[PDB]
Write a protein that holds these residues in place. Structure first.
Motif, short mmCIF file in Angstrom:
data_model
loop_
_atom_site.label_atom_id
_atom_site.label_comp_id
_atom_site.label_asym_id
_atom_site.label_seq_id
_atom_site.Cartn_x
_atom_site.Cartn_y
_atom_site.Cartn_z
N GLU A 40 1.93 -4.80 5.77
CA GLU A 40 2.88 -4.47 4.72
C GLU A 40 4.30 -4.87 5.11
O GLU A 40 5.14 -5.14 4.25
N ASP A 97 0.83 -1.20 0.00
CA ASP A 97 0.00 0.00 0.00
C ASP A 97 0.87 1.26 0.00
O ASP A 97 0.63 2.18 0.78
N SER A 119 2.26 4.07 0.63
CA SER A 119 1.74 5.34 1.11
C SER A 119 2.83 6.02 1.93
O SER A 119 2.57 6.92 2.73
N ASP A 121 2.78 -0.83 7.58
CA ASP A 121 2.14 -1.33 8.79
C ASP A 121 2.46 -2.80 8.98
O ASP A 121 2.98 -3.44 8.07
N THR A 157 4.35 4.62 4.20
CA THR A 157 4.20 4.10 5.55
C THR A 157 3.86 2.61 5.52
O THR A 157 2.93 2.18 4.84
CA LIG Z 1 0.26 2.06 4.02
#
Ligand SMILES: [Ca+2]
Ligand SMILES: [Ca+2]
Ligand SMILES: [Ca+2]
Ligand SMILES: [Ca+2]
Length: 182
Positions: A67, A58, A60, A64, A62
């Protein structure tokens, strides 16, 4: 619960926060590196953004817990690409052997590329002439111009040109979807 995570193998869920140890429980471009640079490993920025688009499911800026693991098992095998190839893949998007400021500056979308700073960067990364970066320039843009075949900069770094590869190897992948099933 008595069984849900993979704590049996090793502190992986922790390995995730092991990275975002100063953020808040998320891995951003800054902590992206901060995490592995702790265990001793040492990657470059390009690797960070490279892992974001190539691993961050994802992207972005960032990562998590999710991820993370998906990006951890990737580097968890018999892979070899902890060199310039990191950017050579993203920066050298076309992967022809060079990156004209277009591909250079473009690869810096998060850098807010501008005609003021990132523009000088064309000339700031331009190790041989055209405000571009080639496997050789991207190589000399951080290190030096070794006398060994390793050279790859544009025909100007010395006098000779360069030797052509013998062939590219690849493994490939398939089409898999995961979400409600695990
Ligand atoms: Ca993300
Ligand atoms: Ca963090
Ligand atoms: Ca190219
Ligand atoms: Ca150049």
């Amino acid at each position: 619960a008595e069984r849900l995570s993979e704590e049996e193998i090793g502190g992986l869920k922790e390995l995730f926060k092991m990275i975002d140890t100063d953020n808040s429980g998320t891995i951003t471009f800054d902590e992206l590196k901060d995490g592995l640079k702790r265990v001793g490993s040492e990657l470059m920025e390009s690797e960070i953004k490279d892992l974001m688009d190539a691993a961050d499911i994802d992207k972005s800026g960032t990562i998590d817990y999710g991820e993370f693991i998906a990006a951890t098992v990737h580097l968890n095998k018999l892979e070899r690409e902890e060199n310039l190839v990191s950017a050579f893949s993203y920066f050298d998007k076309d992967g022809s052997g060079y990156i004209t400021l277009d591909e250079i500056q473009q690869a810096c979308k998060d850098f807010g590329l501008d005609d003021i700073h990132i523009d000088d960067m064309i000339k700031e990364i331009d190790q041989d002439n055209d405000g571009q970066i080639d496997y050789g320039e991207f190589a000399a843009m951080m290190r030096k111009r070794k006398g060994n075949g390793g050279i790859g900069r544009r025909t100007m770094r010395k006098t000779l040109n360069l030797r052509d590869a013998l062939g590219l190897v690849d493994n490939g992948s398939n089409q898999v979807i995961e979400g409600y099933f695990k």
